[PDB]
């Protein structure tokens, strides 16, 4: 999101592609999962697509 903010032009689309093979990145820690969920919700609200 910070990288997106730095851009000074007008962006019609904003996209992130996540290349991974770990379906449960945080299985040991539940708090990290909740933080990730909150941040993902905020990013979706801002208008950032996540794939």
């Amino acid at each position: 999101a910070n990288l997106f903010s730095d851009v000074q032009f007008k962006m019609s689309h904003k996209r992130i592609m996540l290349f991974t093979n770990e379906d449960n990145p945080h299985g040991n820690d539940s708090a990290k999962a909740s933080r990730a969920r909150t941040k993902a919700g905020d990013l979706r609200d801002t208008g950032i697509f996540l794939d």
Binding site: S34, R37, T38, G41
Partner: protein, 229 residues
């Protein structure tokens, strides 16, 4: 002796026997003094209690070349049968077969020990009304009543959790993920939906396998409670 065999047979769980394209439910209690066996096929019940002399005579007759004391024979029979009753798919050689007569049932067991043959026959006569009652009718009623009590307790727990969820919602908060919302629990609606939808597949006793697989700890608990008083 006889009392010990009867009490032991009472305290044991049911086991499933696959034999010659058919199924049976069996309870066996074998001790050095004799043995007791109860067989069923969900239509009739059969019982056989045997002391030492009968075992020795039958062993001499069938196994012509075997010469062993009754205690050793019963121990070998226990070692042969218990593995199959406790758990199936065991790597043990034990073939079972059943015959029929006007009333009796002959259950034939063929196996090998040290690779040498070992035959036994159970001559089970139709079980007396008291035995069938005490082993199936009353324990099953106790199991049903216990499960009903469990259902009521779990319903009370659900009501408590419903009240707490209602309090949390009244506080004004919201879920981070909305898919977890669960509707309020009404006992009548749940029972109606169950009876309409899931009862046909839940009440199918089939050939006895579900009873052995699911309801055995409760059966043993109920029977043990009955033994005490």
């Amino acid at each position: 002796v006889m009392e010990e065999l009867e009490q032991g047979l009472l305290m044991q769980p049911w086991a499933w026997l696959q034999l010659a394209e058919n199924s049976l439910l069996a309870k066996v209690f074998i001790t050095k003094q004799g043995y007791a066996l109860l067989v069923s096929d969900l239509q009739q019940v059969w019982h056989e209690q045997v002391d030492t002399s009968v075992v020795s005579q039958r062993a001499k007759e069938l196994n012509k070349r075997l010469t062993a004391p009754p205690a050793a024979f019963l121990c070998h029979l226990d070692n042969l049968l218990r593995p199959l009753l406790k758990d199936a798919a065991h790597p043990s050689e034990a073939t079972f077969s059943c015959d029929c007569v006007a009333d009796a049932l002959i259950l034939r067991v063929r196996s090998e020990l040290s690779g040498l043959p070992f035959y036994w026959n159970f001559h089970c006569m139709l079980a007396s009304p008291s035995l069938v009652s005490q082993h199936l009718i009353r324990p099953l009623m106790g199991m049903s009543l216990a499960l009903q009590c469990q259902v009521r307790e779990l319903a009370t727990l659900l009501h408590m959790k419903d009240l707490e969820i209602q309090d949390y919602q009244e506080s004004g908060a919201t879920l981070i993920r909305d898919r977890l919302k669960t509707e309020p629990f009404e006992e009548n609606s749940f029972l109606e939906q169950f009876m309409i939808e899931k009862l046909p597949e839940a009440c199918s006793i089939g050939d006895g396998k579900p009873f052995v697989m699911n309801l055995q700890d409760l059966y043993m608990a109920v029977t043990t409670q009955e033994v005490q008083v």
